[model samples]
Target chain A: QADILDGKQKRVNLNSKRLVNCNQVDVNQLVPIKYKWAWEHYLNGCANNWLPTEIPMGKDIELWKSDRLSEDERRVILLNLGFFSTAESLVGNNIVLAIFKHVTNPEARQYLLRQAFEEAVHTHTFLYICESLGLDEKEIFNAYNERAAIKAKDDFQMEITGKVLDPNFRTDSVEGLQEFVKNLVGYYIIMEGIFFYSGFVMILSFHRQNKMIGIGEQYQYILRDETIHLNFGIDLINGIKEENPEIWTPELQQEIVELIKRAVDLEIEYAQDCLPRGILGLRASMFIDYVQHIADRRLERIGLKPIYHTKNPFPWM
Target chain B: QADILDGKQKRVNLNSKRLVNCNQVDVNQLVPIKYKWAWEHYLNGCANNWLPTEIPMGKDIELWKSDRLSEDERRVILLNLGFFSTAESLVGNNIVLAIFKHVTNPEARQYLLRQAFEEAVHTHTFLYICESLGLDEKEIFNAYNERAAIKAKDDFQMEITGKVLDPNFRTDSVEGLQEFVKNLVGYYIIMEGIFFYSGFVMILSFHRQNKMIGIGEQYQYILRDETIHLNFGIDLINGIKEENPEIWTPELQQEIVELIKRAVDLEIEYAQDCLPRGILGLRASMFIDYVQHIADRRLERIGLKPIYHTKNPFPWM
Candidate 1:
């Protein structure tokens, strides 16, 4: 049975960023058949890419940090880090899969999907890094995954092809399109840029010192393709802005700036709690410096001057 | 409630240079064809494209600062940086990823699915970079994608083809397998290494200059990729590592050294943090000369004592 539009049409055009398609997003959704796809092959790329046993203990044992920190300690660090793990996983897969669902223009979405997979693989790499560090991520994302709000957001997103793209579709909340653009913008911009921005740098620090040089190299590959992602992100926001000058204005920028800040703040606080001094090249002060700097840069790239990179600044990468 | 293993096997054998499939494990005994065949098409490869509208965002929202912060503020920078980010997401995205998998043959297992996705887009652009940035990705893993997955995924996922190929087969499990490969590395690697490495430097640069060039480039890209949904909440299959024989080796020790060099510093001074200013083969002088050197001394295989990089670290990249 088809689900009925339960008075959701009034909110149809909630926001105006044309959530038209994945490729239309502001950032450069990477080119198709890139590294993201490589992992796919590596997974079952060749023959017999498996081991004899089922549950491997080495990873579990490795996550056992030398110190017998209580499970809570482990949980604190692991979960905080796990938040990133969760973020990476979701963004990596959904960007492309979701894009594949709604794109009216196939080529653009293909380019973006190419970049999306790279993001996916990079995200997967981070997960493996955690495994190497000896933290079991089994329970890390349980809380968020089980949340009703998140689930709702996900349900809304899952319908990219089902309802959002239906030209004849009308929601009880709004007009022809209910939550289409809003959902699209959220997935393309807010989530990718602001939400994932913090985590991107967190993993790079290890690579900086040549400590995880290998990991850093991996980031480089991801970043190289990411320029397109950025292009797509710019496209996501600007395309919509271009379409509806009224709905999106300098005023809106000012408003979402706060939204960006709030998200950044959450990430910063969490980072502060998880990464202490003498670890990951960060501290309370460092987190603020970095987040603010990133915020400023993001603002400027989008057009705003943002807070002076120097005045009351935090840090720079 | 504790389950005990039968004497059939106490544990999967462990060895540094483990011939993971060295045991009398049969090739057919590995994963089912559904798991193996589909992986090549979608898991880590780069051919898969994202649909339009998958990533949508408003133009007004600006996220990060991308500026310099004081050394004190360097800690929290969340954006992925250039050098390190490039190393992890771009460089290691393929290199180490190629080696990080669990294939028993080492050759097949060494396939870098994640890295391939990360590099495919940018690798093709290496020449373009030379045209645009007046620099070449020559020294990097600047090759292009080898089309393998696109053909396969299309075949498997295409209803028309599936009907012609194996109508009676359960594609749900096959799709599940494809999804499994997409998420094989889990999100830890994305969080810990790929995303974290870049963020570390981005945070640092934010602390110092309040402006980041290389780091910013990497951050935007990683951020774009970072936000897409992949498989954030996927759990690591226990005993699965047992099937993956590619885990151990003296190289892991080198990986640790590389990991530490990227972060964790005893030097409290800014000079110690910012002195050399982006040395080749390393991000910072402190990390390259002090931390990494010390770390190398502790690692297993090569005693990490290369006086200097005679060749670019990623010449093949």
Candidate 2:
């Protein structure tokens, strides 16, 4: 435990440190950081510091009030807002409540703290959007319960979160460490990487057309933040694997691929629900291909072969 | 519990909300925030965003290499660095690993997340100072173990932190809630509130003499951040008392007062060690009086009577 004050007063050895099961050194000592990437990520996150309120939402409010948007476009916007309203909070809570507890390295935890604050900023961004548009806050925030597709995606992530939340869970055993890695995949690769990107494409596509430009601008900023988050999460996951190679069996690799495949399916279902009729020269089919392409990119980033050879339909993304 | 997706489709009621043990509302929802103070604090924290490396240390480096400084001055500088090296990390870990898991309000948790990141920056600041000064990494980082005064302070805080870290600890009952509040008092009141201020006085005193201005400026920035942290923590502690009055029994209040008294004594011992023979016209007695004065201020903020009626020795502070 990081809270434990080591009476033996042993200095932290940078040579034999593991990410999760690191008991040989004082976890509280962050100097002589072995993981320079984590510190770099913290610095990058600070450079990207912003507030949702800093971006003006006047144009978005005007556009939202005017009859400039189609029913399909409105539905897409509302659905994405609803999905993100709770999604960011979930990611933030998981970082503070689950991942920080397990990732024992001080530098990594520093980055995690920054990421959690960013998640709060992302959550605040959606709330700013809702308040600006004079939309029904309760209805939009509760869409995870009312909308089946959104609920399905949230349920998928929550199930993985539950394993780490279990009181009996520990990362000492290979199976336990694999479960923890599965959590990294579920949140980082699937939720942030796959689920969040679909919404980014949907919202930013409208921005490209010069409609709801304020909302689109905020989404662009969020997309930038999430890109760093995705990269940091990938580094953390891969670092854990390198530190504990015994946990990375062929079975776990196949299982993670299947998990990504399932995540892609859920995201596609959400995309279809958001745009039953296409909007802005984009269709659900394009999102399906886009998700697959992004999934392949994410997989390759984590050293997995591309499961789908689909190219990104929107190269501008 | 925040991860649990509500299947019943209930809306969060803003009326009957408790910070913790809030099972009546969806903890994931950030809109309709009842605690507006927390949201404001989050904004304030964002407005104060900074990094340690941004501050230059060239002058401090020159002064350290030059023979203009006395041995006592160098020892005071090294002592403050040593004490703060692990102290900041300890506070950050407790925030992430313990306090965050228990605070259920989304807005308050948002502030807590921001505070946690600030703690990380403070930790990084100490690292930057140590590196810039060409200090031995092992001796300074491990000073919490090697030095008795620092060890006593750390041990006192860790004992309270252990209560919240216990796997079976919950905030559902009066006893459990009281224990949680004690953890808050230990970190917020004693650690950030009382323990850090004395060091601020000692270090910034040097900056007043145009010596080690780089290190002093960083401490000033940290002091600004800590002021916000202290106020937020006081609000959190008092807010808990208002919501859960049953936990704020006479005995509990008295216990907290005693805890502050013990903290004052430990801090005095630390001050004595830091300035064995007074440097820069500052003595151990002045810090003793300053700590008591701040302790009373902290106690008054938290609805307790002043134990020591000491006047502020340094009015500028």
Candidate 3:
């Protein structure tokens, strides 16, 4: 019975030495990697090493505190900053607390930990921007809780990340892993793939008009990291699915699909608030379409139907 | 009473945007750092980043497979690789699962995460060495559990780290933090500061004799990283002590002193086995003396009285 599906075990262990279907990865026994790609991904992440401090935020800082931008533009900028300032932390928390604990493979766990460090970099990047721009720190960071739009997005993430915190959460059982996939959807597919993509577009859209180029460039680097992050999640999900096909039931797949669908709706609502008056340079509608386009790509990549069927409205993005 | 100590709170948050004592850190709300040194440490870690794969192990591989090496020499090398192969993973797991969960300051947590990645790098460095040297994978990794001498050192760490993972472990109370201090002593002072130093001396002595320069070079890089790691752990211990002086009772201070003494004894016994027959002009006694000297420095650095006033016998190291 254990010889099925290329000799991978059905349950993941906290301390296995094998690469695939290992019972639990021993902290000391890692080699002849069961999954080469996981190691490659981690090495690639190390290769793409960066620091937020290296990117000069001069232009963005100048443009921000000056009178050049309109009030609505500034508000939109603050909204974007507010949303991302804490979002990276949320993603990081999930990685350490939720996902890293349950994933038993050392290579997979290794990559997840690598991603977690990158998440820390992302978190610091946001903080560096806030510090450089001299934004009202409390207002920008507290906006997620203080502003309805931002809170809506965070609330959605909280509900998903909260599942693993339950003492009742189990990874060894089909029931545990099934719920784990929901967290995967919540973080990798929805948060990193869709939500982060949405924010990147908004920042880059501003950068398109030559606003906040420094922060925009920072966003570009962060986006690159997120791309790797999203892919890692996909690989983890797909691997898990392949290893234990019984867990990736049609019902779970359907649930994952709906998770993204609702995620898109939440982003749309948030985007509407991002540019309620609808700036001439960049409209909320364009951002909405961009989110759909990004969401569709994410959906298809995970072997799901593209519900949005949305085209890339902003080619420059 | 909560307002005492400049308004620092009693409980430590898992994530904090502000540096001072806070309930929880809003990931979005990071700026105006309280722990400036922690941020600096993280940045330093970012700057010191290097990939294990980038370093060539060809020479070491050749040296390992050549007739120039005696069986005793090869055995010593294998034991070195075997112990480190899993030791790094142990440090990494403890960082993410045990330490990161309790350290409330974002910047402190951030640097700890940086160290986690470095541990992963160190782990991979060992793997890269094993792969290049073409050692028996099973023998190299299983040494920690299979070998009595190796298991003693590991068992020492397991017991210390296990305290934090206790389900009842809390970071908010004086008792909890006292236990946390034990975890710190186990990892920072003993495991890293002392144990790793003993290994470095043994390997660096080989490099000094012009044997296995590639692996030696890798150890050089890892040693540099561990220096920073030891310092970070020291700072963490110091910070906790400063924040809650009550936790650093003289009784516990004596406890830490005894902890290092016992750790020294364990390493000495392990060293005797690491060089049972004395190979390549190096003896088990030489390594044992080196461990004592290294242990004294670690003890002094941590404000503990040196139990072994052993002078550096291997000045070449």
Candidate 4:
């Protein structure tokens, strides 16, 4: 196993098989990027520049305080508000601290920086929503812990990210690359691809009923950003697997399938808490199925077989 | 000494002196920033959105080949173009890999991230200009080392940043913080504050003569960005000293003055190379005085005594 942290690796042409990790990135000397898609992703990210404050959260406040929302509906809104208030930080921080340092390609690193900045914007989006709705900042931020389901999702992500953050992490070996791929799958597939999409659809469902349209519209912008993020992450993961094919053993592939399965189960439990009484014609099972459907697509994107055959019930989503 | 890499720094109030260094930042759980100024700086940075491509380079191409320009003027433009093309990545890489991790405050880190993004954008600006003007990409990038003066400035910056990028970097003591402050001074004061301002004046001086007007306009936008960067860096350096007065010894302060003086000398040598034939009524020595004057302002901003009492030679710049 080669140590990803080892900067002694002989430098090669700027290709996928280049002998470097993210920290060894020579900012002063970058070869022409082999990954043109990374550049395109960055361009798309910049083109989608936005401010959460520019969105009219005034209507969200009114909807939040309105009698039209059922108790269950209110619970779902607050839970999501609280969960995402700080959850986006997990992804943002990981990109800055953990992932960016190991992904030695500068163009890929360029898009990752864009992804990190967008993660901050997403964090600000939730904060803007919470502040506009007059929610206690502490209550919203701390909800990631106090709520069992929210804590469950955060714990899952943290556990997977924890390995990559370990000081011993390296990208040069079969096992090291395996661990790196797991980190990507945990974040790109499960967190952003499924969990965030589930939450986004929950908010957009409110918009579907013509309630909380402002915050929903805000999520629309965020959704667009996340779409770019998910696509970029998929490209990175697939590219790494292609370049390091030996890391993609059948056992590891099966292990990732099971990992997604476990995450989908965790999401199901969280969805139950989000809608214990089933408000606005949205059943808890539909939420579970939607998450499963999203997870299936993500799995297939990475060339893994889907564990669940659940179809998307929320067609509009 | 405490392990600088330890992630278990007790969560403290989000204020200066409350944390050890930048790496302890827990993105998922930040105390609401006690530093309002940091947030305001972030907002201001966001307000300064720009793309280097938005400026037209068509006029620049015409000017590059025009007879109205002396060969010296053209040489100066190409060298300046080449130097900044890679210099920005230096600042951007330092922020991401070196500076951001050591800066503990979330809001300050927020602004730093914004600065890094702006640096990337600035890098892109140069690349766009280089490509648009049909310059040799290899010649432009390779100039950083191939050119003697560019190598001098880069070597100085690499030395300061080297310690911070060292895997052993920590901020748990007076000396630890002292090293950190030197890095802030090296990049922010010497590189951005002094070196970049001199380059800007060179381009702006050309603009004053209506030569390379399009590239000159691009520099104006960049200067606006750099103004905020210098202001932010000064705030960060001064704030560090204020919070840890014990670390800012008179000896270290004098060392910093010498550092900037050496930087001034290197920049003078560079300007001499830039204007060998003294074309367009701008001489090399004026660039030296400009560097000294700007270096004096930066020194004063960071509570150090000025080394040069030189007046601004190019007020139009």
Ten contiguous residues with the weakest lDDT in model 2 chain B: B1-10
Query: Candidate 4, clashing residue pairs?
Result: A21-A104, A22-A102, A22-A104, B22-B101, B22-B102, B22-B103, B22-B104, B23-B101
Under CAPRI classification, how is model 1 graded? Answer: incorrect
List runs of model 1 lying over 4 Å from the truth: A1-81, A96-103, A130-181, A249-255, A276-281, A304-316, B1-317
Show model 4 residue runs off by greater than 4 Å: A1-27, B1-19, B22-27
Residue lDDT tens for model 2, B1-317: 11235643466778856788987778898767899999888889889988888999999999999999999999889878888999998998998888888888888998998899899889889888888989887778888877778888998998898888877889998999999999999999999999999999999999999999999999999999999999999999999999888898999999999999999999999999989899999989998899999999999999999989999998988
> Considering summed lDDT, which 10 consecutive residues are worst modelled in model 1 chain B?
B141-150
1 or 2, which is superior by TM-score? 2
Q: After superposing candidate 2 on the true structure, give the runs of residues whose Cα lies further than 4 Å from its correct spot.
A: A1-9, B1-9
What DockQ does each prediction reach against the true complex? 0.02, 0.44, 0.32, 0.25
Weakest 10 consecutive residues of candidate 4 chain B by summed lDDT: B1-10
Residue A267, model 1: lDDT of: 56
The CA lDDT at A274 in model 3 is 79
Q: Which 10-residue window in model 3 chain A sums to the lowest lDDT?
A: A1-10
Q: For model 2, what TM-score is found for chain B?
A: 0.96
Q: Which tens-of-lDDT digit does each residue in A1-317 have in candidate 2?
A: 11235643477778866689887777998866889999899889889887888888898888888998888899999999989999999999999888998998888999998999899888888888998999878778888887889989999998799988876789889999999999999999999999999999999999998999889888988999999999999999999988888988999999999999999999999999988989899989998899999999999989999988999999998
Q: List TM-score per model, in order.
A: 0.39, 0.96, 0.89, 0.93
Per-model B-chain TM-score: 0.32, 0.96, 0.90, 0.92
Model 3, B1-317: lDDT tens digits are: 11123213222233334322345444334454667788788888888888777777788778888899888777677778878888999999888888877776667878887899899889889878877887666557666756777778998888888778765677777778888889988998888888888878778878888899888889999988998999888888888887788888898998888888889899888788778788667777876677888877877776777777777887865
Top candidate when judged by TM-score against the true structure: 2
Candidate 3 wrong stretches, greater than 4 Å? A1-28, B1-28, B277-282, B315-317
